[PDB]
Amino acid sequence: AGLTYSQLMTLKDAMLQLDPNAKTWMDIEGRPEDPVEIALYQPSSGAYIHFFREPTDLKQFKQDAKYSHGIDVTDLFATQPGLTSAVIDALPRNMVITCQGSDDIRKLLESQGRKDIKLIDIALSKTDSRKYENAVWDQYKDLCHMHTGVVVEKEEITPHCALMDCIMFDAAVSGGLNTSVLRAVLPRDMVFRTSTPRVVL
Numbered sequence: 001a002g003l004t005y006s007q008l009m010t011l012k013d014a015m016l017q018l019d020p021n022a023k024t025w026m027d028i029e030g031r032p033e034d035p036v037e038i039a040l041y042q043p044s045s046g047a048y049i050h051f052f053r054e055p056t057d058l059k060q061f062k063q064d065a066k067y068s069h070g071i072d073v074t075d076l077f078a079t080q081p082g083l084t085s086a087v088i089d090a091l092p093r094n095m096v097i098t099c100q101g102s103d104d105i106r107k108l109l110e111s112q113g114r115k116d117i118k119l120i121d122i123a124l125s126k127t128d129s130r131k132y133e134n135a136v137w138d139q140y141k142d143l144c145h146m147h148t149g150v151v152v153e154k155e156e157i158t159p160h161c162a163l164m165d166c167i168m169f170d171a172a173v174s175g176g177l178n179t180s181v182l183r184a185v186l187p188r189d190m191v192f193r194t195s196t197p198r199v200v201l
């Protein structure tokens, strides 16, 4: 089972925090039939939707962890099951989503019966898409702690985060990196079934 009725209602109310006509980036880590990290980002307000999912196929996950996202699967055991379907079900009707390489996003959305959502494929080159990568992690690394493993290429590389990807691709297309305080749309008790409280220093 997934979200309770009150979680669904809380989620429906939280989605009103998105502007259904504003620019909205989306990115995922993992394959579209088996995603482990999902992010949606509205640069205009700073609002973002960001959550995690436990993988079905461990073998593919462990390859993605080594070559892409660096996520330790044990850190996904406490995620809310069914959240991916509930968030996508809840997205505003006929909203427009921007992505870098729309194919994976499109397959995800279509698998959930959301063909009404229009996609904008930004099609940045590899190097252009990551031109603000280091700056984006430095400004915003506190927003995602889930990329704990070392990630390699065909040489070590900075892990890929669906949320950092949205921020840096928007900056690359906008032609600079804004100073904006971002804000999580989903409550933390929705993202994780059991969650660590804020650290008391």
Ligand SMILES: [Mg+2]
Pocket: 027, 028, 160, 161, 162, 165
């Ligand atoms: Mg990406």
Ligand SMILES: [Zn+2]
Pocket: 037, 144, 145, 146, 147, 160, 161, 162, 163, 164
């Ligand atoms: Zn991340």
